[model samples]
Target: MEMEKEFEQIDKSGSWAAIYQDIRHEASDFPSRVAKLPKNKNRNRYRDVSPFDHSRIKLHQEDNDYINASLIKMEEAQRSYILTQGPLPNTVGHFWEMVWEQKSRGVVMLNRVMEKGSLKCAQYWPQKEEKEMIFEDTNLKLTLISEDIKSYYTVRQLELENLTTQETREILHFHYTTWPDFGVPESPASFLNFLFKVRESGSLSPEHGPVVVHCSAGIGRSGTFCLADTCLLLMDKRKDPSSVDIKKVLLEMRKFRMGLIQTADQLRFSYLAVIEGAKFIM
Candidate 1:
C-alpha cells in the first residue's frame, strides 16, 4: 500500500523532517471553531487549549458551565476518547464532573504534576497517603483504594462518590509518569506494554463511555497515544497491519481535537509505535 511505503520512507533517518513540516502546514489550515466560542475564551487554562466546535463535549445538567473537553470518536475502529487539558486548580471540580457525567471508567493522564519547574497539571486525584480528596464545587469525593507503582507508570484504583446522591463508582487512573512534555517515550516497547495494560482493564472498550485522555494541553502526547491505539486496532482488524495509514488516521483525529500530535517528533514517534505494535500483534 502507498501508506506502507510512506512509513518505510519515514523510518529513514532525516526524511521525517520534511514530512513533519508538511503535516504542520496542513494542520494550521484546519478550522478551529470552538476556540472562537466566547464562553471558552476565559474557561481554557491556556489560551490555546480550546476544543473544535464540531467535536466539543457539552456539559449537561450544569448551571454556570464550561469544560475544556472534546469527544474524539473513531467509528471505524469502534473507539471513543475524551481528550482534555490537565486539570487546573479551579477547574478540578469541572474535571470530576466531566468524568462522572460521562461515565468514564478510566483516566489516562500523560503528564506529571510538575515538569521542568513548571506546573504541568494539577494534583486532581487523591494521594496515596491522604487516601481521599473532595472537590466541593462539583460535590464529588475521590478516594484511593489501591496504588501500584511501576518503573514508568503508576496504576491506581479509585472510587468516585457523588455527594448529592451518595452514589459511587470505581475508576482506574493510568498515570504515565516518565513521559516528558514535548517528547516521546524511551522506546515503543515500554509504551506498547503500557497501552496493553490499559486494554486489559477493559477501560477502552466501547461498552463504556470514552476513556478520558489528557496531557498538559491535551494535544501532543495525548494525540500520539490515541492515534497509535486507533491504528493498531485497525491493523488488527484488517489482517494487513502495514496497510494502516498513520498520517491519515491522525488527520481524522485532529478534526475532533485541534493541534493533536503537536510536534514533528511526536508524529514520528506515533509511526514508530504503530509499526512496532503491528509487529507485536502479527
Candidate 2:
C-alpha cells in the first residue's frame, strides 16, 4: 500500500518536474579521461555521452582499451549489467570482443538500427540473407540462427565464434523495438512483459557476466530499464517495498555511469513501472 500511496501521490500532484530536477542535481559526475582522449574519440557514439574513466569497462587491448560502455552493478539485487552505446561501423568488432571476453549471456537492445530518419546504430549482426559476418580486427564470426518476433520486441539466437580458436558460444539478443527515443514505453505492462522474457531466460542471473544493454546513446532508455528492473528486484525481497528510494537507486547507478534516466518523463515512467511491477512482486 505504501508503494501505491507513493505512486498515487506522485501522479496526483504531478511533482515530477521538481523531483526530476532534484535527481539531476544530485547525479554524480567524474572525469572521463579515456572517453575524452583523441585516440579514442571515434569510439564514443555521442560526443556528450562518455563513461567515467574509473568505471568504464576495460577491454583486453593494450593500446586500445576504450569502448563507450559502462559496467553498472546493483549489489543488493545481485545483478550486473553492461550499458553501452550502439556500435559504430568501426567499433563493431570491438563490441563482439567485449561480449566474448566478458562471457555475457545476452545483449538487450532498446532501439532499432534506424530511428526516425537518423541512423541510430550500426547493423552489427547479420540477417537471414547473409547469415554470417566476419570481423578481422577482433577475430570473431557472428551468425544468426533464429529470430522470434513479438508484439513489441524480437529475440534472436546468435552463434559467436572465435576465429582463431574456432570456438563458438550461443548468445541471445533481446531487442525492444517499439520503445520511443528518450520516451517511456507505451505502458508498464508491455515493458514488464519484455523484461520477464529476459528474466525467464536466466541471462540476467549472476551465474554469467553482466548482460549488455544498449540503446542509441545507451543512457536514456537503457538506464530506465536497469533502474526499473533493479527497483522491482529490490522490492521483491523487501519487507516494505516503498522503502526502496527510486531517486537514490538511480543516483547510486549514476555513480557507475553518467546521465542515466535522461528525461524527466523517463524518471517519471520509472516510478510508474515500479508501481505497476510491484503489483506482481507483492
Candidate 3:
C-alpha cells in the first residue's frame, strides 16, 4: 500500500503549531486518563552499554586513502555508517562494533553491502525468509515471517552472549514492530493501531520489555518510528506532549542509548511522527 502523506514541511515556522494541532487531534482525551497509570519501571539493560567506545576508537585519517578509494568505491562498499560532511572517515572498527552491539540489543542496523542506485542499498539479512538470510552469525540474526508491516523480523533471534545461564533460561522476547511505507510511511490510524495493540497486551509495563525499531539507516524512518512509539508510551502516561519537555525527553533518550536518531532527516521525521501519532489519541 502507498504511504499516507500527512507530514508537515519542516522549514516553515508554523510547522510546530501544526504539529501541536495534529497531536491533539490524533490522540483524543483517552491519553489523559491512561497518562495517570504508573510509569513502567524496567530499565533497558543495554542502556549502560555504549554503542561505540569512542575513547579507544581509531580513525581512518588519511584523506589520500579515501581520495584514492573514491566516493563511488566507498558507496559500493555499503559502509553502514553515514558520515556528515567532513574529511573524517565514517566507517571504522568501532562503528562496526557499535552496529554489532545494536544488533545484539535487538536494534536493527542496516549496513550497505552493495550499492543499488538512489536510496537503495544492500544490507546484511540475519533472519530467514529474507532475501539475504545468513544463519551462522551469532552477532546478527533476522527472523522470517510472511506477514509484517515491512519484512517481519525481530532482533529477538540474535542470541545474547553476556547473559547468565539463569537469565538465558528466562524467556526473552524482543518486540520489534514495523509499519511499511516509502519516504513517510506511517499514519495516525495505523500508528494508533500499533499503540493499542501494545496497551492491550499490557506490554507497556517495564517487565514486558523494550521495543526496537529501524528502517534503512536507522535514522529518518527509524527515528520517526521510534519517536512515535515513545510519544505513544508517554501519552499512555500523560495526556499531552506539552506535559513533557521535548528537549528533556530527547536528552534523556540520548543518555539511554547512543545513535538514537542521529540525523536531521531522522529528527525531522520524528517531529512529524509526533505531530501525527499524537493526534490519533487526542
Candidate 4:
C-alpha cells in the first residue's frame, strides 16, 4: 500500500538519505520560549532539543513548571503521546511528576541508563534494594513492586504516590534494552512485538492521559515508535491499510515538537515497522 511499496522502493534505490534530508528540511522549528528561560536552562537534556512552547507539557509546580516534554496528538484517533528526553539527575522527580500530573498509565522507554561508557540516562526509578525513592520537591514517591525481565526488554511495575494527597498509582514501565541511539532495531517484528505488548495493556488508548515515550533526546527512537504506532492506528481505524501516509503523519507530529525521525535509517525502519504491523490489520 502507501508505505509498503515505498519501503521496498526506498531500500531498493538507497533513497533514505534523501528522505531524511528532506524530512529535516521540511520539519518546522517552533519556538521554545519556556525551555530557553534562564532558570530552566538545565532542564533540557540537549540544548538544541527543546520542547516547543506551543505543545510543551507544563508541570504544576510553584516556582517553575517547565519540563522538556511535548504532548503529541494524533488527529481523529484520540491519540495522546508524550515525547521527552530521559530524566536527568535533577529532573528525575520532575519527570515522575509529569506522569503523576498527566495521569499517564504507561511509560515506554527506548533507551538504557548507560550506553558505551556514557551516562545516557540517570537511574531515575527505584532499585530493587531501595524499593522506593522519594522526591521532596514534588511530594511524591516511587516504589518498584514487580519486575519481569525478558531477553531484550524488561517490564516493571512502578507505583507512584502523591504524599500530600495520600493517593497512589502504579504504572507499567516497558523498557526496550537492545535499541541503539541513532539506529533502528534488528527486526521490525521484534519491535512490533514490543509495541503490541504495550498496546495489550491499553495504555495508548484515548481514555488514558498519554503514554510517556522517551529516549536520550526523545526524537529519534521516540519519534519512530510513535509514527509507526499512529500510522498503524490510522490504517486499522480506517480499515484501509493502503491509505496510510507515514511521512505526512510524521510531519504533523513534528508540529507538536521538532526533528522527529532523526536519521535516514530511522525513517526507513519506521516504514518497515509500519508495513509489518499492517499485515495483520486486514
Candidate 5:
C-alpha cells in the first residue's frame, strides 16, 4: 500500500492545501487559446469562461463556434467525459446540439437550476408532466419519459430527437442535487453511491459515447467526480488499492479541462473518495 502510505504522510503534514495551491499556480500558466476566440464569445454561458482550443468540443455545422466544453479522455482508466459549463438561456440549443452530435448517452449535472438566489443553469430539460420541451434554435425536442427522485440525486429518462430528421435517442440525466457550488458533497459515501449508479447504467463504459459532466462552471465538482472515478478505475485495473496516484491523476485530467478540483477541500475529498472506493475494489 505504498500509495496509502504516501497519502498518510501528506495528510499528517497537512499539506493538501499547499498541494492544491501549487496545482492552481501551474494551471494558471496554461494558454487559453479558444477563450480568446472573439466569434465564440457569444457561445459562452459566462463572460469570463471559454474552452481550451486543444480539448474544446467543436460543433459539426458551425464553422467557428465554441460552447464552453471540453472532451476529456482518460485513456488509462478507459473513461471519456465531456466536462462543460451549465447551459445558458441562449446557449441551450447549442448544448443540445452538442449532445446530439457527440452521441452522448448521459448528462451528469452537479448544480441546481438556481443557487444562492441566483440563476445557475437554464431549465434545459422538459418537465415530467409537460412531457416534452423543444429548443427552437436547434430544432431539437426533449421528452421526459420518467423520473426517479432520491434524497440527494434524481435520475431521469429523456428522449432527444432531431426535429428536422426525425432521429431520436434516449439520454439519461443524472442530477446530483445536494452538492453545493464550488464545494464538496457532505460525505464520500453518498457521492460514491451516485458514481456507482452512473457506472451501473453502462453510460460511462467505453462502448457508449462520453458522459457529459457539468456544474455551474464545470470545473469544481465536475472535476472532482471525474478525478475520483478515474482513480478508482485505475486502482481496480491494477488490482491494488493504493497503486494509483490521486494528485498525478488530477493533474493529468486538468490537461483536458482547466482548473479542475477547484478548492483544497475538494482536493482532500478526492483523496478520501479514492481511498474509500479502493476498499470496495480491493
Candidate 6:
C-alpha cells in the first residue's frame, strides 16, 4: 500500500488508549444488552420518532437536482459505491450514479469494505480478476454495509484472536459487533482486532481515498460508523461532543442520501455506539 499523505496528524496513540480502556471495562455489559437494546423504548429512537422537517426535504430535493443536472461526470468515471447484498441487486451503474450525485454536494466517494467478503461477492466484482481486479478497481470508494463490521474490519479469515496486521497498532479503530452473517454470532473481540488491522492499514492511506461504511441497506451499520467518525472529527476540534446528538447527525446524513440510518434499531445502535466509542477514545 502507498504511504498516506503527511498532511494530517492523528493522535493514534492517545486514541487507542481510550478505546482499549473503554472496551475492557464495558465488555461485560455489551453481551446482555445487545438483544434488548433494540427493543427498549428509551434506547431505540423510532419508539419515539421525531417530526420530519420539510426544510431538510427541500434541501435534499435541491441537492438531488443539482447532482443530476450540474455535476460533471468523470471523463472516464471512477468507481462510485460498492453494492453489498440486499433486496436490490448491487448495480454498478446505479452506484456510480449515486456517488456522482452526492459528490455534486461536495461529498467525495471512496472505497467499500464488506463486513465479510465470504457472505457475498460484490455485485460487480469479477472473481477471475481477484487481486489484480481489486488493485485496478481500487479507484472507487464504497462502504461495507454488513452487521458484522467488527468481524469484517479486524479478523483474518483463519486466525482467531490474532489481528491480521500490526500496522494498525496506533490509531483508535472502532470494531462494533452488531451483525451476524449466515449463522455466526460475530464476536465483540472482532472490534478490538479490526482496530489493529485498520491502524496498520496505514492510517487511512490518502491513495486509498475516503472511506464509506454501511450495514444492511446502509442504515444501522453505516449510520453508526459515520456518527462515530463525526464524533471523532468533533473531538479533533476540541469541541464538546455533547453538542451533537446521534439522531441529528443521522438526519443530516439522511438529508444528503435517501435511506441513511433507515431503521430505529440501526439508529439506536448508532447512538449507543458513537457515545460508547467516544467514551472509549476519550
lDDT of 5 by residue, 94-157 (tens): 8999999988899999889999899998999987657678899889998999999999899999
Q: Residue 155 lDDT in model 2?
A: 95
Least accurate 10 contiguous residues by lDDT in model 2:
1-10
In angstroms, how far off is 269's CA in candidate 6?
Answer: 1.4
In TM-score terms, candidate 6 sits at 0.40
Per-prediction tally of clashes? 1, 0, 18, 0, 0, 14
Instruction: Give the least accurate 10-residue stretch of model 3, judged by summed lDDT.
Output: 65-74
Candidates ranked by lDDT, best first? 2, 4, 5, 1, 3, 6
Question: Given candidate 2, what's the lDDT at residue 39?
Answer: 89
lDDT of 6 by residue, 1-282 (tens): 101111012123324334324323432211122213433223222222221222111113232211111111111112122211121232343333333323311121111334466322134322221231221111333232222223244221110011222111111223334455433223323443343354355433334423323233443344444444554455445455455544444444443333444443443344444444555565
User: For model 2, what is the alpha-carbon lDDT of residue 138?
Assistant: 88
Model 5 segments more than 4 A misplaced: 28-30, 239-241
- lDDT score of residue 262 within candidate 3: 46
Off-target runs (Cα >4 Å) in candidate 1 are 1-5, 11-13, 28-42, 129-131
lDDT of each: 0.83, 0.89, 0.34, 0.87, 0.84, 0.31
Specify the highest-lDDT model's number: 2
Q: All candidates' TM-scores?
A: 0.92, 0.96, 0.41, 0.96, 0.93, 0.40
Q: What is the lDDT of residue 230 in candidate 6?
A: 58
Model 6 spans > 4 angstroms off: 1-90, 93-123, 126-178, 181-209, 214-216
- Candidate 3 deviates by what RMSD? 15.4
Q: Which scores higher on lDDT, 2 or 5?
A: 2
Error of 2 at 282 (Å): 4.6
